[PDB]
Amino acid sequence: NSELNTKIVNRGKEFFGSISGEKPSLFNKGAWMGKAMDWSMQNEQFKIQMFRFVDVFPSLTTSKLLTEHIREYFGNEQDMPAFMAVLNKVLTSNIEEMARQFIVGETTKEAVKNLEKLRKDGFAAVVDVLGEATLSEEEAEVYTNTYLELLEALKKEQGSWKGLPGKGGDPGLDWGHAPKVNIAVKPTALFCLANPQDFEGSVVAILDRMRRIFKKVMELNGFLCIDMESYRHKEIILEVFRRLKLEYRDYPHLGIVLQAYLKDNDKDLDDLLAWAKEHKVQISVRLVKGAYWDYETVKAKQNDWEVPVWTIKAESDAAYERQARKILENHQICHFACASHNIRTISAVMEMARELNVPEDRYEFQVLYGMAEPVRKGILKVAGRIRLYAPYGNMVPGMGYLVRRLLENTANESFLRQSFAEDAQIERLLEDPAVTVERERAARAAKGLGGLPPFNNEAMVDFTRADHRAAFPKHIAQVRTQLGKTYPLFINGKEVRTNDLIPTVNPNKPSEVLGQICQAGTTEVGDAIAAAKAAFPAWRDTDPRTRAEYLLKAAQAARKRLFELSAWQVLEIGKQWDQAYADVTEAIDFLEYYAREMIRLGQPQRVGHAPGELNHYFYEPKGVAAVIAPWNFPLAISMGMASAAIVTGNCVVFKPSGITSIIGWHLVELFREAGLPEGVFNFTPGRGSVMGDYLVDHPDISLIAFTGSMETGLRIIERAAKVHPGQANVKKIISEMGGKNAIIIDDDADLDEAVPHVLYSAFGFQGQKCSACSRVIVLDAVYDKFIERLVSMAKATKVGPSEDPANYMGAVADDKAMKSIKEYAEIGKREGHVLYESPVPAGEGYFVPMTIIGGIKPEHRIAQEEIFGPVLAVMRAKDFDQAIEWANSTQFALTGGIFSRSPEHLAKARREFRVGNLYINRNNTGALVERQPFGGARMSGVGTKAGGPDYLLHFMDPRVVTENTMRRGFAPIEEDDDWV
Amino acid sequence: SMLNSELNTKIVNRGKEFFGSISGEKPSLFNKGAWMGKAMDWSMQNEQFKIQMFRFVDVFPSLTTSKLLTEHIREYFGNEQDMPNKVLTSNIEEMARQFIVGETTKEAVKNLEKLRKDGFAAVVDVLGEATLSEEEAEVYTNTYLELLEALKKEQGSWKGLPGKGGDPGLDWGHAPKVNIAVKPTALFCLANPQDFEGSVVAILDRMRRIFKKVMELNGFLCIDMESYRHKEIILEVFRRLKLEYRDYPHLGIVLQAYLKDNDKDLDDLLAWAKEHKVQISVRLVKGAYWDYETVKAKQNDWEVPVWTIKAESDAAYERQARKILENHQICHFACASHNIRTISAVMEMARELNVPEDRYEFQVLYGMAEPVRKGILKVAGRIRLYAPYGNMVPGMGYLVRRLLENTANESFLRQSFAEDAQIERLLEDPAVTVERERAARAAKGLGGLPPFNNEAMVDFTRADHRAAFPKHIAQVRTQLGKTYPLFINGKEVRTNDLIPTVNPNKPSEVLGQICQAGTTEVGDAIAAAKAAFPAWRDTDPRTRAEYLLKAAQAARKRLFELSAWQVLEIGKQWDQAYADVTEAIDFLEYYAREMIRLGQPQRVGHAPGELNHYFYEPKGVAAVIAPWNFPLAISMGMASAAIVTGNCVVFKPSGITSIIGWHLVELFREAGLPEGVFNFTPGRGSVMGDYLVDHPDISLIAFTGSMETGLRIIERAAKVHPGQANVKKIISEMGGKNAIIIDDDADLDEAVPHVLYSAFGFQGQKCSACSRVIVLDAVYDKFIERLVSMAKATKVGPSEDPANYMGAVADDKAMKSIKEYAEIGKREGHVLYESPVPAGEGYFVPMTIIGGIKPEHRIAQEEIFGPVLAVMRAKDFDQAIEWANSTQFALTGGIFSRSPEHLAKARREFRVGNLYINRNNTGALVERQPFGGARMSGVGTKAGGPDYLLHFMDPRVVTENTMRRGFAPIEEDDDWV
């Protein structure tokens, strides 16, 4: 709209004029922070070092930690920038000063005092309470009580404050209309287990605390704003706002933050306004662009989710202006807080409101305390109604907040950087962002092999979606209509029934029988081996691209059944919703990845370059593969091992674990739907005590793929090494065995991240993973604090049936597992000291308490033996060297983790913490195909890594054909010949 | 320069007149009105068709049944509609007849007399398949004698061709009427510069017999020149024969202008003739083996002996022709070329130098370049046709070579008569063409290292290489009698248990005494290796690779010395010994590069906020248990692979090759390898064998040797003992029972010597050796007769004497075991050949060939590891493949066949680790032939290939969440926005 746009541009021009060249302190090159940010902006390596240093800074609580980190992040004094122990003191004082710039105080009393100073300078405030991530109920209560404490202090003071001057209205209110007390609350800080996987439980827990705060706010006629956090919780937070509003439909001073950088926001704003109209209530919206842009883009890309944010910056600006116009048009029902430091954005809001003649009591402006100083002052001068978002509290979360402000101010796309560091042209700065979008989209308008798209991991289940949340109960219900079947063997394309049946039951409810499984004797296993051996010649002679096509069809068949296949796993083996879905996506990943790997490896390659000669190097299968699969990843690992053997040209005799035989039957369904030729895949569940050695010992077996315990793996290795009469090959072992995996918690670890990652690593799926954290090795000086937070978080979780998404973990695999694990828990309780032992439900189910035991040392049994259940050992290391020594003190070497923000300690861990899969600053479980090829050596395996580029070669043997191409003195000349 | 321009003008003007007098007349091969011209036309337009057609003509004479013929036609040319029996046969046969003067002596003689009446002289050549036996050499020799007897009776009635003066009974008044050419290698089936003196004498003795008959007729004998391999031998034959008959003027030699050596060879021969005051004759040619020499040199890292720009050969010809003409007083000249420029250049140079006509003549091959031949007759008058005669079988091979000559891209005939090239380009001074082509031609390794190339094989065309072996064998003999200690943690450790090591061809010759490690010493070595491991593991992969490169240079500098040790200690022939050392060098160079390639962590996945790096780590202590049959090569390959990947090695050489094992100590010491990284512990298997394999500090075992021992090791290594860190990794190369299939259509000239070498090279003591030859029913009798006849020509004796084909086997135990197997085989089949062996000491087993062998027989199944070859008669090709696949082994295999269908079937179904087509099945080279198989022949590990180093390591992944406080560094390969 050209005329309006011209007014906006002129308003912006007047604004830049009234600023008089003033730079915000962060861009003041005369100040230390300005020099620091200037160099960060010119030098990306320095920015990364400086910003990461500020992040770790509040953990550097001794002189040694501090001195060492300074050297590790910035190098020696001679190699540092000019603007930078005396060095300890100067750096410390400058960083602390930077953080204080952005906070109104450290105590409630100080905050209140400083808020009054702000009022005398003409500024209103919205107060926020700084806090570390809420990891427990006790922490949520502290946060809640801090708001209550703040409100009580403000209640006593506000009567003595003259209201900020306005043009009309009520002289006891700010600008004649706004409540003097205004606070903002982060909803997820009110509940440590906030998760849309438990949508209702999360809404209620947050709502119950928000209600308590809100009641006190109303008691002093104040305003409560509910802030918006990451996209993961956006729908939860919207629902919290809607419920609290309907509980107090007549109270006007309740706001919600909406983020214009979200593609969803056009619909969300429209829905909320329509909702307010329908319910005949009023609302208030603080429109922001959004604070988590890099996080959302990374998180979505890590999970093959649609990126929920716009990714061209002008799109967020254009969305803001569009959505602000929508709000202002609806001022009758919607009060507006314009929260932005962008002069174009601010100018657009001002002129749109003027054009729509919106009453001034329906819109105000907000900025963050301590930044964009000239912008703040310009708003005061032109609009008069300006509120500062003012955090207060402890310096530890204050440093985290500081880093976020530094990121915001120094971003390449930041309006503040462009205006105040980069000398950007005013006309460009104030351009209609809609025009910017068109130009940027047009600019941006200007790989796989063999016609196949490149490999990408299958999208994870996404419980931000109502449809994904609804799918599970529906599919679990459908599965229940299918219970009670008898599952036969499947051999040479035919169903073969035996009369030895073993029931398979729900571990969370053993009275619920899912079905009966036929058991193969040695006769039937021998039959299956015979069928596989007979199908082998034609299958080996099938083109690798064709073999790969069967895997691609199986992947599509599985993809079309994703929630159904997932539901079976929830009931048969007690997978939580996310765990079950991830099992199926991983199976799909193996199929898509191994299909592409065979296509890659399937072409004979010329080796050497001598003329008159062609050497071609290529691979052939081995023969019949025995595949012996675990129950803990019943589709993923089964499908991975079987499909690798199949795509490489082998034929498979497959023994699923008894308690997940139905999931094993899914392989039959999937390969049959793909049209796999008869005998290439044979399904023979059976009693190991009857046919286990028989399968491994058989002369017609050429390879054995096994995943499971070390004891069984080692027995297989010993027996397989013998060559019996009639045996064609030396048997090839592909084996993934157990682990006793440690995560190290260094002194400088970010405990907000370390704690929930350790909890998930230890207790996700009841701890039943070869990759699970069973030892947490914690540095002396952070031990007490770490353990308090871990135990408190554990106490908040619930143990119960996996079909109920409210439960964190549930029953273990079967009766034998429960008894074994419980015995290990008793052993550990006599070795160390019990720190936590959860309640479990009464009645039936193979429940083992979520168990945490401290005081564990390397010489203890539960520091050495794989328990495969929810029993976590906590070990206290005297220094980092001992932490590493202890991590390396078992016979296993599968996975490991380290939380540390020390370059030197991370380097030492990369080199010396010699596990097959080492994870830095995140959980040590959940390895993905291609990204984390999985497996190790020592007693954890034989160095084969599933889901990686070396895996398929283990299922084959290389061959070379060498041809003398010269006849009667001449040879064809080939493209890669070394010629003349 | 000014003179150069002037003479070039006369040459160009002579060429222009030569062409003007031809005017549209084409050689019959370029006659597109004929079937021959049509087939060649399409060959020149379509290289794929050329390859099919020329290969078909090559295989054509083996197509002896209606089945063979019909199937080959389809396999080479496709269905009878995708193309461009009795008929196609007549066309190819007519094509071959164009180039030969007859099929019998009498027909040849009649046709030669006809040619005389048409004014053409001749030089007569006898066609033949390759000489593979003494009997064949005698047949070839007697055919010349027969020819000469026939000509002797006729020549008296021949009027000499007209000339300008002289003797009316001689051609042109001066040339002998009878002139024959002989191929020297056809006189000796084992001609080979590795036995230089033996080859010269055997050839000379037959050539002298022919020459005496030639002299009786007062005729001319030309000694033809063959491939570069035999050039020096042939020169020496000519020189000796000339001096035996210093006064007889009618003896010629061919010299090849396409050889870089020829400038010097011609200078040398001319100076030699002067010194000895004799006269000579030279037929100067460009050369017939160009493609072969180029390929052969490139295959062996030898300097290519031929010029590789065609104009360079032309330029060399004109340069060398001038030199001969300058020397006309002592050197008679035959200009042998179909090239009008070349011929015109010679005519003008003869005029410039005023050379008498009786000192030069012109020669062309019968049946080609007809207008060129006609032109020479008209202008010069002295033209002689090279006139081969004989059997259609070698006639077809000759046909192929002529078709190649005529249709080559750079052929002067093709450009003149097919391409309608501009006459100015055709008659250009080739020296100018050279400069232009060089200028145009004037207009990758990694980490700064050159790319890998296999080390050059020993080259016995060189006098220095021939002389080096006797020199170095003698030098090694001055160093015998030493006591060899263990080498543990950088220190020499003696023990009281000594085992002598002796020469298998002369067991009374003791090379030294070897200390034996007890379990105590082996445990000490393992402890040393274990202590050295953490620092070695942490050494940069590039640095570890540098040690291997230093060791490779150390070995390269000692090549002949290291070779000589093997000749004496284990009975390697000179070439076998040198090849063992070059293979060792190759492993070092190749594994160094492989570790450099594999040594850098690679990002995997592309998700942002995350870095996954995938990389490799060594395992720990490796036991390396090495064979005696490739005592440096395989030992060094296994040890250096383990070492470069970051492991430390405890190495047990075979007892009988312990000194070669010591060479590893010497080489790693010279490279400066850190102490403990390589330890040398020879010892008695019965004392410390199981100890070494069972030890809990061993993480890897690299073994090469017998199936029986390999299988025992695999079984024992599977157990995890108390304190054992890893499941032990096996890298194992075991035996074979390798077959070569001889198909009905096999080229027996190649199949026979390749099979003989595959079976008996190094006494058959190779895991890759051919111990079964499976021969198709219809070619059985023919193949076996030639194979046995070639075998009979070879001698068994000490490997230090290069005259011997093979020698003693490794030791007394091997001899006893192999002889028992021979007796078993003789009761199972029937002996076709059993060689004499020397009297007296030495572990000699006869070169033994046994027929009537079937898959149920023990010697069709069990690896003998000695000079015992089973011959098996297959009823059809399907059974041949079935039989090839009938053992428990699958290491190597070979097939001789010119059937695309059968070759395709073999590629698919003959499932050995290394299958060879139309060559021997031994001698695998690093990178070109990564070596190893499965079944009972190994565990699918392939030494010398790109999958090998990974077996000595385990992969690791480090995954880092790079996001802190909502931000992460953006990395280049991130999936982003």
Ligand SMILES: Cc1cc2nc3c(=O)[nH]c(=O)nc-3n(C[C@H](O)[C@H](O)[C@H](O)COP(=O)(O)OP(=O)(O)OC[C@H]3O[C@@H](n4cnc5c(N)ncnc54)[C@H](O)[C@@H]3O)c2cc1C
């Ligand atoms: C008082 C106040 C309260 C706030 N409360 C919250 C809250 O509860 N929740 C929340 O999420 N944020 C909140 N914010 C917003 C956030 O903290 C930033 O301050 C704000 O987004 C910066 O925008 P801008 O108009 O100041 O600056 P600009 O430089 O104009 O805009 C920058 C913004 O654009 C977006 N952006 C950057 N790059 C791209 C890109 N490549 N593609 C698309 N978009 C891009 C980001 O949102 C970034 O923050 C609040 C802001 C204020 C002032």
